[PDB]
């Protein structure tokens, strides 16, 4: 079928600021594996329904993947505000698709911190929907140029998740997969059985 397994069952996930996107098209997909499962902590869908989606077609389907905290899963939704929504991953108000998240304490948490999962902490303006900002330029909080060195009024824009297995459920990492469905007036390359 369509490479859904390569996304959900991926060995390693990307940081939320550098969220990966996989283009799924020109294939026939089976959606039964997802909603029948129970390992998904949250399965929220806007506009479309995974049940009754098996006998449907779509022109383009995107699979966005990233890792965030439990507290920040609620921000992956249309019309939501917060550090993750504003500065890392923003969904449009007319979003059509699903957001799927599950706990990954066993996979992404490491003793002494992961050091590799990062989220954007400082940004002068909010992200537009489906925008990825991978800049590591030093954030200039004042009028003095930073010259690419951290210091007063000059911070590193990215903050590292201290993912540890001894944290609470909220602090534990969650792997999030966002499915975006398009049915534009065009030949439909993504269909079910």
């Amino acid at each position: 079928l369509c490479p859904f397994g390569e996304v959900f069952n991926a060995t390693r996930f990307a940081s939320v600021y550098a969220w990966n996107r996989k283009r799924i098209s020109n294939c026939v997909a089976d959606y039964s594996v997802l909603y029948n499962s129970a390992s998904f902590s949250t399965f929220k869908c806007y506009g479309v329904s995974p049940t009754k989606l098996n006998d449907l077609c779509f022109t383009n389907v995107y699979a966005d993947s990233f890792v965030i905290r439990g507290d920040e899963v609620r921000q992956i939704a249309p019309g939501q505000t917060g550090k993750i929504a504003d500065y890392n991953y923003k969904l449009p108000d007319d979003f059509t698709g699903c957001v799927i998240a599950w706990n990954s304490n066993n996979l992404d948490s490491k003793v002494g911190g992961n050091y590799n999962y990062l989220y954007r902490l400082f940004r002068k303006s909010n992200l537009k929907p489906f925008e990825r900002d991978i800049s590591t330029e030093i954030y200039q909080a004042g009028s003095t140029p930073c010259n690419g060195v951290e210091g007063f009024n000059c911070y590193f824009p990215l903050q590292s998740y201290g993912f540890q297995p001894t944290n609470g459920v909220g602090y534990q990492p969650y792997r999030v997969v966002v499915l975006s469905f398009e049915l534009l007036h065009a030949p439909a390359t993504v269909c079910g059985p």
Epitope: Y35, N36, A38, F40, S41, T42, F43, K44, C45, Y46, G47, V48, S49, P50, T51, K52, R74, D94, T96, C98, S180, F181, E182, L183, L184, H185
Partner: antibody
Framework: QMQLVQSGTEVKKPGESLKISCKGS????????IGWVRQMPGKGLEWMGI????????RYSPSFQGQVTISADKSINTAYLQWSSLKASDTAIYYC????????????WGQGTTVAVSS | DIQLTQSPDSLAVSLGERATINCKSS????????????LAWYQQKPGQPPKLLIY???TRESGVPDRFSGSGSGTDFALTISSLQAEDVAVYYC?????????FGQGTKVEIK
């Protein structure tokens, strides 16, 4: 498919508190949102509100937000509609419907719960 | 918020003929990414809870008789029943699921001629 079962018939008085139940049994309740519909005696359907059991995200109709409260318990796959001060106008039959997402049709419906409030 | 008016309130159609129930919308119910109008049709037989018949105003639910069919776009939509039977005698509602809050029509009773 999925199925919904509601609570039983109740007759109350103006000034009492009431809480009704709607438990869903099926395959894939994680994807389902639960709504509430009121049908006044010999009248049409009225949409009250909706809730997602996983995070209890509750949305209310502007005509019902101030006097109803919708809750859920994902442990028992049950949604609840509750009142504090019942009124004679609340006398109706209440249905709960289940959709597989927001902005989706109500595929699954409950059998309904009859409420009567009078002096 | 988004209104939905039906017509006619009552309708009597003889067996084997065609029924027509109209549904007018205050705003367009068409999405940008899916290009399908978010309208649904329901059937509520007496004593029984409403049952979903047609979603997206064109697609029929599984187990629905082929005589039921949906049509319309923009703000004008309709439900048509060809070769009417006694089972199709119920009050029909059109409901939008474009955005919360959901709204229903006032209902359309289908009597017998």
């Amino acid at each position: 498919q999925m199925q919904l079962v509601q609570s039983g018939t109740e007759v109350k008085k103006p000034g009492e508190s009431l809480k009704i139940s709607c438990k869903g049994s099926g395959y894939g309740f994680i994807t389902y949102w639960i709504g509430w519909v009121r049908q006044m005696p010999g009248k049409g359907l009225e949409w009250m509100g909706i809730i997602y059991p996983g995070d209890s995200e509750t949305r209310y109709s502007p005509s019902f937000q101030g006097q109803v409260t919708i809750s859920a318990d994902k442990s028992i796959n049950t949604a609840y509609l509750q009142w504090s001060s019942l009124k004679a106008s609340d006398t109706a039959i209440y249905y709960c419907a289940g959709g597989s997402g927001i902005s989706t049709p109500l595929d699954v419906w409950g059998q309904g719960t009859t409420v009567a409030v009078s002096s | 918020d988004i209104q939905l008016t039906q017509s006619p309130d009552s309708l009597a159609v003889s067996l084997g003929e065609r029924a027509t129930i109209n549904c007018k919308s205050s705003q367009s119910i068409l999405y940008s990414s899916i290009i399908k109008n978010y309208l649904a049709w329901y059937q509520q037989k007496p004593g029984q809870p409403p049952k979903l018949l047609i979603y997206w105003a064109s697609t029929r639910e599984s187990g629905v008789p082929d005589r039921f069919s949906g049509s319309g776009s923009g703000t004008d939509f309709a439900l048509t029943i060809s070769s009417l039977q006694a089972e199709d005698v119920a009050v029909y509602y059109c409901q939008q699921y474009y955005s919360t809050p959901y709204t229903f029509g006032q209902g359309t009773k289908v009597e017998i001629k």
